[PDB]
């Protein structure tokens, strides 16, 4: 599913990501834009052999099982394929774990490099939320 911007904002808000670990909704929407262009089916191979999955490009080295990431963990207790669903619940549950792991949203390189410190409120402009 390719979410609209406001459509994603509303779903993330409903699932409790606004202010989660102190990160305002626009941070999450910005991260999703640059991670997946709001496409739940997005995937990305990494150089280490892990893969990133879904709306927030959650990685198989620690967070989900894909059966092809040697030595990896599955801290969200999910198949990575679940991160590709049109329903973002699994991605949100897992993102909450990730952002709680110590480095906040820096865990998303795209967020640090493209969203951090920017006008993230612009991401939710116009949305009826
Ligand atoms: Cl915001
Ligand atoms: Cl694996
Ligand atoms: Cl933080
Ligand atoms: Na990524
Ligand atoms: Na894994």
From Swiss-Prot:
Gene3D superfamilies: 1.10.530.10. In the egg white and polymorphonuclear leukocytes. It is an enzyme of class 3 (hydrolase). Its EC number is 3.2.1.17. GO terms for biological process: cell wall macromolecule catabolic process; defense response to bacterium; defense response to Gram-negative bacterium; defense response to Gram-positive bacterium; killing of cells of another organism. Disulfide bonds join 6-127, 30-115, 64-80, 76-94. Substrate binds at residue 101. Coiled coil: none annotated. Pfam families: Lys. One of its GO terms (cellular component) is cytoplasm. It is found in: Secreted. The active site is at residues 35, 52. Its main location: secreted. CDD domains: LYZ_C. It catalyses: Hydrolysis of (1->4)-beta-linkages between N-acetylmuramic acid and N-acetyl-D-glucosamine residues in a peptidoglycan and between N-acetyl-D-glucosamine residues in chitodextrins. Keywords: Allergen, Antimicrobial, Bacteriolytic enzyme, Disulfide bond, Glycosidase, Hydrolase, Secreted, Signal. Residues 1-129 form the C-type lysozyme domain. Lysozymes have primarily a bacteriolytic function; those in tissues and body fluids are associated with the monocyte-macrophage system and enhance the activity of immunoagents. Has bacteriolytic activity against M.luteus. Lysozyme C is capable of both hydrolysis and transglycosylation; it also shows a slight esterase activity. It acts rapidly on both peptide-substituted and unsubstituted peptidoglycan, and slowly on chitin oligosaccharides. Monomer. This is Lysozyme C. It comes from Gallus gallus. The gene is LYZ.
């Amino acid at each position: 599913k390719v979410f609209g911007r406001c459509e994603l904002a509303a779903a993330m808000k409903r699932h409790g990501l606004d202010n989660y670990r102190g990160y305002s909704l626009g941070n999450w929407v910005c991260a999703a834009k640059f991670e997946s262009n709001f496409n739940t089916q997005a995937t990305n191979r990494n150089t280490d052999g892990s893969t990133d999955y879904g709306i927030l490009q959650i990685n198989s080295r620690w967070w989900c099982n894909d059966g092809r990431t040697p030595g990896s963990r599955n801290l969200c207790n999910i198949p990575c394929s679940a991160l590709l669903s049109s329903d973002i619940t699994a991605s949100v549950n897992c993102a909450k774990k990730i952002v709680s792991d110590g480095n906040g949203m820096n865990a998303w390189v795209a967020w640090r490099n493209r969203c951090k410190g920017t006008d993230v409120q612009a991401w939710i402009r116009g949305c009826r939320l």
